[PDB]
Design a binder for this molecule. Structure first.
Ligand SMILES: *C(=O)[C@H](CC(=O)O)NC(=O)[C@H](CC)CCCCNC(=O)c1ccc(Nc2cnc3ccccc3n2)cc1
Ligand SMILES: *C(=O)[C@H](CC(=O)O)NC(=O)[C@H](CC)CCCCNC(=O)c1ccc(Nc2cnc3ccccc3n2)cc1
Lengths: 88, 173, 88, 173
């Protein structure tokens, strides 16, 4: 027996900036989006789902400085909450 | 302590794990048993390019992301300085890995220069573009081309410019 | 005094299907995505933020029938949870 | 009772509203006072086309979405059977509405035929395309072109095909 499945499902993309716009990177400190994402994942993977975490990353960029960027979540087909349950 | 496998990632306690599983009914992605699962992640990072500026500091990103994904239980493959064609070949190979069958999820990380249209390969120039589109990444990892990851979260992270604009507008208070 | 603001922020797009794919519509019952969205908004606007609601809409499409489609959330720059607080 | 302004939308009680505001700190979008706010929404729906099949049942969608957005406190403008150029003109006019200044959010609803590239205008054919891109919608409503909606949720809902494929693959259990 054969069954139908959605061709595209359970995806989430997270980009460092909005379309048309630059993303910033420091020669010794690395990319700000990457560093920010690691920090937030380290902090919130235990209590928040990945979509929640990505929103928090976005919020941390809310107030623009001299090097503004706004990380964007794209093409989301997550039907459920993705909890990482670190330690398990 | 960060001396454990999860390093600097704050641990989810058994009480917290039971509370999250109780608060929400059947709206969470199932996690496979730790003893048997074979979680896979892939990082593609381009630092040195033929015709565009060097991505100094990329090594810090590679280190951080590799360690983070390992902390979260993923076996990380790291590939450096690839053309768009080479990225496609690597992605197709990743989608064919037998470990995905005994996995519950995957992470894909792309770090390079970028333009509006997509992610830059090592050979990219304005005259002869070398671009991998986000659309191609999704297609290569969907149910048709990667049946092993059916029903499983596929997280794609992209560090790249998406154009030349500063991303800001002025306003007065 | 002038201040910088992100050019693109606080957006959420919700599409009826995934790229390349059809969205379904009944001649007397209307579009399935629209009908499903209304139902979920009526039910969950009181207790869930809009992003949560859209995920629930997606989940309702999870099991494919003869007319499968998967609604997609796109280009999200919501930095906060958007609660509608119906009645307020 | 559905006889109230909110119709069939389940009400958020004062206790529930206080609980949500307490559970999360400064991670919720601020809502303006009900007595003073001027919330705006726009529905663009194309049913009758020059060269492509009629969207029978679209009126059910218009009714449902109009009533829903009104229930949620939005004043709804409904525009029917527009070309892509006419949609652009309508969107630009919407972005210029003075009410957005005294509003906390907005909803945009597009309902039409669609292809991979975007949303079909009334005059659309394969020979001479009449398409509004999603990219254009975002640009017209961003901080540069719509400063009044700075920091305010802009929800875009699109009912349209995005191609001709059925969106499914086969698998065996
Ligand atoms: C676009 O294709 C690339 C994307 C990429 O990831 O390489 N981006 C660039 O080429 C941009 C130019 C638009 C970066 C060029 C490098 C110049 N860097 C800076 O001017 C700069 C200056 C200061 C800082 N500060 C800073 C402060 N805090 C942190 C914390 C964490 C990480 C980094 C960081 N950096 C950064 C960059
Ligand atoms: C693509 O451009 C358009 C998008 C649009 O909104 O118009 N879509 C189409 O043209 C599709 C073809 C791919 C629709 C063509 C119309 C044919 N309709 C059907 O075959 C059909 C059959 C059965 C149902 N059933 C059904 C069951 N439950 C519900 C519940 C709520 C709403 C609708 C509904 N419909 C629907 C459609």
């Amino acid at each position: 027996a054969i069954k139908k499945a959605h061709i595209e499902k359970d995806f989430i993309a997270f980009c460092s900036s909005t379309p048309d716009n630059v993303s910033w990177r420091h020669p010794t400190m690395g990319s700000v989006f990457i560093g920010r994402l690691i920090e937030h994942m380290q902090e919130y993977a235990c209590s928040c789902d990945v979509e929640e975490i990505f929103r928090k990353v976005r919020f941390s960029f809310e107030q623009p400085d001299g090097r503004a960027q706004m990380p964007t979540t794209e093409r989301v087909t997550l039907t459920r909450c993705f909890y990482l349950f670190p330690g398990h | 302590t960060s001396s454990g496998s999860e390093g600097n990632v704050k641990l989810c306690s058994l009480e917290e794990a039971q509370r999250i599983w109780k608060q929400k009914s059947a709206e969470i992605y199932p996690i496979m048993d730790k003893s048997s699962r074979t979680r896979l992640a892939l990082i593609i990072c381009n630092e040195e390019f033929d015709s565009i500026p060097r991505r100094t500091g990329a090594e810090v990103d590679i280190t951080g992301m590799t360690m983070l994904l390992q902390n979260l239980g993923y076996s990380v493959d790291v590939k450096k300085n690839l053309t768009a064609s080479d990225m496609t070949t690597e992605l197709e190979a990743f989608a064919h890995r037998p470990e995905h069958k005994t996995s519950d999820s995957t992470f894909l990380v792309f770090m390079s220069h970028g333009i509006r249209e997509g992610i830059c390969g090592k050979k990219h120039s304005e005259q002869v573009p070398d671009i991998l589109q986000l659309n191609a990444i999704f297609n290569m990892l969907n149910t048709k081309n990667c049946p092993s990851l059916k029903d499983k979260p596929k997280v794609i992270i992209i560090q790249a410019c998406r154009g030349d604009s500063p991303g800001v507008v002025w306003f007065k208070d």
